[PDB]
Amino acid sequence: HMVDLRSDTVTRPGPAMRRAMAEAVVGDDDYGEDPTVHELQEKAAELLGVERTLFVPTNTMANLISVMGHCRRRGSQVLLGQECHLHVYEQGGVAQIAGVHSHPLPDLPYGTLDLNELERALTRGSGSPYHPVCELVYLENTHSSAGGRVLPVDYLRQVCLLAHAHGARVHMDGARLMNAAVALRIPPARLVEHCDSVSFCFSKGLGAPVGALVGGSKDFIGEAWRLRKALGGGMRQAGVLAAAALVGLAEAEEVLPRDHENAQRFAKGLQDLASPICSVDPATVETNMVLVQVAGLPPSELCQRLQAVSAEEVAQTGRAVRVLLFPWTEQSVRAVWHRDVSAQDTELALKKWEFVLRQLRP
Amino acid sequence: HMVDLRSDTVTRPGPAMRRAMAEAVVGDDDYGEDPTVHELQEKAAELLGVERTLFVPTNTMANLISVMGHCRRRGSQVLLGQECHLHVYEQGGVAQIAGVHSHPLPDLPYGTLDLNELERALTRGSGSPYHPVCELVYLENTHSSAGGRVLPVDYLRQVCLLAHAHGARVHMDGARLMNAAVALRIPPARLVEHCDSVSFCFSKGLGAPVGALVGGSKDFIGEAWRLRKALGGGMRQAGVLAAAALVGLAEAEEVLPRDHENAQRFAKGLQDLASPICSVDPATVETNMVLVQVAGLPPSELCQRLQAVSAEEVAQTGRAVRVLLFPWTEQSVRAVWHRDVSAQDTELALKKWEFVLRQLRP
Amino acid sequence: HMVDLRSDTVTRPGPAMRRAMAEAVVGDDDYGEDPTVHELQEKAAELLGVERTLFVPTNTMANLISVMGHCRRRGSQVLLGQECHLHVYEQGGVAQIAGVHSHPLPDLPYGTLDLNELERALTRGSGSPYHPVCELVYLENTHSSAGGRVLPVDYLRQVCLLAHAHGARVHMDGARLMNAAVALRIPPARLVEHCDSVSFCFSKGLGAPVGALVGGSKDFIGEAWRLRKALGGGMRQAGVLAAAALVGLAEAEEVLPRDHENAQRFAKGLQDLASPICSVDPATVETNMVLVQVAGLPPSELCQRLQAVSAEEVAQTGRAVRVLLFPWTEQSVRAVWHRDVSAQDTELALKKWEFVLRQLRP
Amino acid sequence: HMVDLRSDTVTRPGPAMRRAMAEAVVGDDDYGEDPTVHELQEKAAELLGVERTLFVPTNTMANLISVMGHCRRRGSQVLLGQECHLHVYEQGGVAQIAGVHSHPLPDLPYGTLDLNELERALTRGSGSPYHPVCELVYLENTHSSAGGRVLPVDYLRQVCLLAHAHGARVHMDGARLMNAAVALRIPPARLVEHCDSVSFCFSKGLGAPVGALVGGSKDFIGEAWRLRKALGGGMRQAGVLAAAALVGLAEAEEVLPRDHENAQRFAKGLQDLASPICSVDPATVETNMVLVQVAGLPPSELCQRLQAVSAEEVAQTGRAVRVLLFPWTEQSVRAVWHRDVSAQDTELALKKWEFVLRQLRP
Ligand code: NA
Ligand code: NA
Ligand code: NA
Ligand code: NA
């Protein structure tokens, strides 16, 4: 048995998705003739509260397009977080493709930026021609590096007021925006109301194989077409991929709560072990991610034992569970849940954790 | 009835493709865990005679990655054709994304570059620190703007000898490389032997919904991984798309000849009309493209009548055929054939052409 | 003795210039406090018929700033000549710094672009989102690679009408704009009336050691300040350099005619030699440049003998004149006159030419 | 009377400089024919312990060239300080011109980077293909935003050891490197030994009108020639500017100590006032900069009164001193000394400060 808790991208297509792709009325998206792409775009337009949307291959390109479509002035700056995906895990494309300066701000605890330091950054070069013009504030809901932490609607409101005052636009990396709205029990459009543009991934928690989109005003999405074309994302018969995305877009309000519940149950069960090696605050688990603090054991070696299977595991637990994880920081590991991790898989991992912890118990 | 001859991109998935997508063993390609992507990559590596390949969303990104991975020096130049796809229909991404200077050379007749002007250009900045360092010679086989003209193997050899002498690499835009190998009756690797890297489109004549790849040495493809990731093409479960691509890769050497025959038959049938309005030399038709010279009628109005249907069309011909075409030059229109145009569709178009020409015969 | 006819950049400061630099009321140009910079900027503003000007280190940066300030849209194109300085001798900075696509057009004979091919290029992507947006037409008066050929006021008018129709701006590389206006006997502002922006070099024919400027509307020059700052041209006490430039700006209408007369006299004297090796049409000499066609002798080797001095030269001519030149094409060499070449130096070179030609006379 | 303490850039040419410019043996530096440029370059090479140097218009271009010549890989990162000049006051040219990602680290107190956060950053993407390749560590000696704080030789050594271990190069922004070497009483080459490249400004404390240079190995400076040419800094007769630079380079080890003494004396005199409004620790004054902490008064209004002159100022002090200063932070102002501020000017400022403080003493 294998429980892959490394990321929510490993979701494989389900039966409904696989048929939807093969039963998809397709066309040339470059000519604007794929109806299944057109459906996904307009369904997500109402879901996200934006005028238009634009299907893109990845959410990485979705962010790259947004930065390029907002930060167009030569000498423009984006205000972003120090541990957001755009700054860390996107090859620095803000500079090597967009040519836009980045001023990162701290946000590690709760995925939020200090609105005082935001005001300080938005005002330092508010008019001076000696400083780059900050034209975009980049937010991440949920924040992946912080542990899937939800950004409150109130924090979203304040950021925009501060940004829109100093003449800057607001984009939200909504790679896990459905996870945030599921946790807050609010419609997803209430989080995007306080934004100019948004990104949205289908390949993560929703279960789709490939797909993402940019959302915003009709003009911003119209300018986004040329940027998607130039970056290499002008696919032809992409209604094959939009069909599976439409299925997961409809199954979000029933699949994602299960991943949050499995995350909470795991965090509780791991806390009920009281081990000096591993510590988890079940209240930090806001969505489908559990950040486990490891002490005394290198996070890489803990993952190695959770993935390994020994005869003694079959002695105490009875099963052979290979728990797959990623070491996140130097003292922590990250587990992420999805629709392909069952609730009994969650219990199987907890028992694998029990065995592993006891073997390395101080 | 409707015959879409605007481009070979409008190829829609067949039943075998649609089943292959839904029956695909998929995984996270970003982690290198999609086996169907690995299969398509390894099959095309042997087909093209390259060490490795890399599945990308479009051939536009495949070309962009090749330029970026070859023209890396600050102050680098690419030698390309004046009417090649990279120079005209890719939003100038060689400059706005790659930051690479372009020196275009004429290529309109046969898709070939004058080896004298190439040698002169390769020598002007061979050592001078006042000129950019030419690091890539960009070729297009087949050449789309010229009418799918095939580049001879000997011409390919000479270009490399001239380039490899002055320390430049050779990339071939093989968006229609399978069409070239079918016309030349040679395996595709014999055209790529005289290259460092190559591009290869699946979404055109091969019938796939989405997909392309970059080919070359293992080192070049390893550098291509970061460029695909940074440009936004690092998809996750892309074995869904690779599965349909594998079907078209196996059906190419039997589907594309039918498209060449339909193109030749159409050009002949148009030549057997002897009309002063339209003229086509059936010897210029080397592949699946027919460049029709228009006289007396603006090329846009010819396309409008071929798509339109009138009561008199049902009087003279008996059917209602909507032939879809794109005006190409100021005095010509471009027709491109694919697997979704049947041989009787070609005859239906020829009859629609007859009617249109006869109404405005002067 | 030495007559350097390689370029007009080798002009060394005169006595009036050297005192003007040492007697210059200077200040911090970055703070806008250098009055000698302010004087040169406003004097050139009236001279060129522009609202404002901006002193820059080189004319290379002046062009780079103009392209950046006009071609600001992501996916913008500049229409320029194939043998203009921006395309050939500026390290392809239109792409590697500005990130702007370049569509070069032929202009070799008279430095003019075929207005039909200009219309064709300005219309091909006039609205299509598949093509880059042409936002700048780049002209060169005089054209250096063509042999200092003057662009007529009428040709300037037509280009602008064609450009301003399709919503593009016009910049003129006026590195030798005073040479053009001196030849046409018109004030320099009459050539810039048909332009949006202009460049202007002081280090060439005017005699200054360092300096250039960008001219245009007050907004374009205000946006140019940030671009000059970012590229590294925000000098501090540059009134030292502006003072020498103001001297040459006042001495242009008395120094430059002498360089044109010496060029014509040389071309005549060389034509009155009737040598099969060298040929010069004295009517192609429009300004201070003479393009000498060489046949039977590699242009590099002719320059080597003109620079060399032998005992036999002292036998036939009596003097030891080292004529310094540049081989320009594969069958031509380029001579350029300036204020540091005297009229007797011109006669000394012609005699050195006589001797050299006779030694290699077929 | 007027004391300009806003920056050390306002240094105006002295008589020896003004004579040196007018007595300069100049030539075309682009052809490598300006001997005075060659002299300044060779003298600074021995002074800084580098193989070669390259005269550039500004130190902004010198830094831009260094970043471009080090951070050349597509997907490269520079490790720099959060308040360093490259990150704040250079229009983000690291991205909008160089296309290089920036990971800034805190440095506000002592201008030093936390070697733990540096090691952590140098290891996060030491091999991972998901992270940009860190190729340059950027240091600033002295650190301008921190108040001219000197970086110790030992701290410089450790940074290189950490960088050279993880395969990164070290560049030092030596805009005020002579101020650092005067404070440390060491030859300047001992600070540059722990570097690959360095920058060096002449227009600041040294007194020159215009000029700076890049230093490093012969190969790095050879690559710097094309970058200086492409950015627009390839001047012709720059021995005019190099001549004045040679004067300040020889007068540095006797002029800069006077500026350090005036800064210390001022800070002491301000400390001997014991005012609740303004506070300065004279031990933070390491060079020619005094960071004055302001309380109760917005820093802008303090500068307005120090520049203003009233009848009561002539009543209490007897003179009319206009002290020119820049508000630096939200609670501080920055004073910088240079050769054009005399020791009695410092006493006149201190008396102007006394008056201003006493009027608003609470
Ligand atoms: Na997925
Ligand atoms: Na297709
Ligand atoms: Na000069
Ligand atoms: Na100065």
Residue numbers in the entry:
A (entry chain B), B (entry chain A), C (entry chain B), D (entry chain A): 39 to 400
Paper text:
To verify if the results of our screening for Tha1 are confirmed or improved with the availability of an experimental structure, we decided to determine the crystal structure of mouse Tha1. Mouse Tha1 crystallizes in two space groups, in orthorhombic F222 and in monoclinic C2, with one molecule and two molecules in the ASU, respectively. The PLP cofactor is visible only in the monoclinic structure; however, the active site is very similar in the two cases, with only minor differences. In Tha1, the PLP cofactor, bound to Lys242, is stabilized in the active site by a network of hydrogen bonds and salt bridges with the side chains of Asp211, Arg214 and Thr98 from the same unit, and of Lys267 and Arg274 from the adjacent unit. His123 is making an aromatic stacking interaction with the PLP pyridine ring with a relative distance between the rings of 3.7 Å. The expected tetrameric quaternary structure is formed by crystallographic symmetries, with four identical units in F222 (related by a 222 symmetry) and two identical dimers in C2 (related by a two-fold axis). The RMSD values between the single units (around 0.26–0.28 Å) indicate that the monoclinic and orthorhombic structures are similar. As indicate by data from PISA analysis, the interface between units A and B (analogous to that between units C and D, termed “main interface”) is contributing stronger to the stability of the quaternary structure in comparison with the interface between units A and C (analogous to that between units B and D, termed “secondary interface”). Hence, the tetramer can be considered a dimer (AB + CD) of dimers (A + B and C + D), with the first dissociation being ABCD to AB + CD (as determined by PISA). As a consequence, the tetrameric assembly of the mouse enzyme has a lower stability, with a ΔGdiss (the free energy of assembly dissociation) value of 5–6 kcal/mol compared to the 40.9 kcal/mol of the bacterial enzyme (for the ABCD to AB + CD dissociation).
